[PDB]
Amino acid sequence: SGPVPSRARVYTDVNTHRPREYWDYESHVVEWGNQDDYQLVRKLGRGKYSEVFEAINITNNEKVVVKILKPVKKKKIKREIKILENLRGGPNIITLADIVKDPVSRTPALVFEHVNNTDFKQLYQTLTDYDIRFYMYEILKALDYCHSMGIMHRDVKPHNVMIDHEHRKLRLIDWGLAEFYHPGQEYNVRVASRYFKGPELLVDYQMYDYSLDMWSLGCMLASMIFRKEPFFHGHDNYDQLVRIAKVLGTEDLYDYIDKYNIELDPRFNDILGRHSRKRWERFVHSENQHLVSPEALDFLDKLLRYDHQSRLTAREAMEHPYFYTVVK
Ligand SMILES: Nc1ncnc2c1ncn2[C@@H]1O[C@H](COP(=O)(O)OP(=O)(O)NP(=O)(O)O)[C@@H](O)[C@H]1O
């Protein structure tokens, strides 16, 4: 029989009305810049797929960020490049300034605009109620834009949000896990970082959509307003679902899997237990009360739903009373 199919409730067929070239990233021909324009200054770190450097563009004297891609999962390289080009200029989307071949690695190196970020661990401790609202609204601008352009980010988390708090400026970065949304398409569930993974990923439901990003944003919101980092603190991908079930309850979880004719991994049988849905007030205390309001709680509740179809869209989120106090 198999799982019941799903489609996005918004921007469903945006890519089908595009030229093939827009989404067929495999056919994309990279336009290469000159590597000698960029002088590496220091290494900022490296992940699974790349090494990241602060650099200078010696032609304009500007600071840039250079991500030198490792020679692996090369399908991702043209996918990221194409998405960055498609989204360039969009609200709060990081700007790809250049693509060059690194002489040492012989691999593509992506050159981005510099953004003056502060450690989210340090920064979130300082955010006022107003600032959480403000920056949430800025993230939503980015998400509604990429979703409208037929793209899901799939790795929304604090590390992928660069905030210049001095200039009240925000950019959504690291589009290397991003994909084009095509209705009916089955996607890899091995995306997002543990604490930000949606229930759809955790129960191995492949026919997911933009709404994945909205769960991830809800996890961010919960962590900020409740000052609990992370909000859902799983030991592994299985315990992650259990942590979610302890807040949202097991009956709505079983209703979700029943709706999509999904079968839980049988290892959950002995660890999931039975849990009531909690009221969001359970998580409020003297130290976080100033960040919590009825509006915040209602908005959070509408993001953190098991059913990906039930979650607020980015545009719906922007309509929420929580943002009425934020100056437009
Ligand atoms: N557009 C940008 N402007 C300024 N700094 C950036 C930009 N993009 C990334 N960085 C910085 O570069 C550093 C490393 O980049 P990133 O690609 O996230 O590697 P990473 O953090 O090692 N990945 P992981 O170890 O898997 O979490 C981060 O700490 C960022 O602060």
UniProtKB/Swiss-Prot annotation:
Residues 35-40 are annotated as: Interaction with beta subunit. It is found in: Nucleus. It is an enzyme of class 2 (transferase). Its EC number is 2.7.11.1. GO terms for biological process: apoptotic process; chaperone-mediated protein folding; DNA damage response; double-strand break repair; negative regulation of apoptotic signaling pathway; negative regulation of double-strand break repair via homologous recombination; negative regulation of proteasomal ubiquitin-dependent protein catabolic process; negative regulation of signal transduction by p53 class mediator. GO terms for molecular function: ATP binding; Hsp90 protein binding; identical protein binding; kinase activity; protein serine kinase activity; protein serine/threonine kinase activity. Its main location: nucleus. Expressed in gastric carcinoma tissue and the expression gradually increases with the progression of the carcinoma (at protein level). ATP binds at residues 44-52, 67. The keyword Cell cycle applies. GO terms for cellular component: cytosol; nucleoplasm; nucleus; plasma membrane; PML body; protein kinase CK2 complex; Sin3-type complex. Can use both ATP and GTP as phosphoryl donors. Phosphorylation by casein kinase 2 has been estimated to represent up to one quarter of the eukaryotic phosphoproteome. Casein kinase 2 has been found to be increased at protein level and up-regulated at the level of enzyme activity in the majority of cancers. However, elevated levels of casein kinase 2 are present in certain normal organs such as brain and testes. This is Casein kinase II subunit alpha. It comes from Homo sapiens. The gene is CSNK2A1. The chain holds residues 2 to 329 of 391 of the full protein.
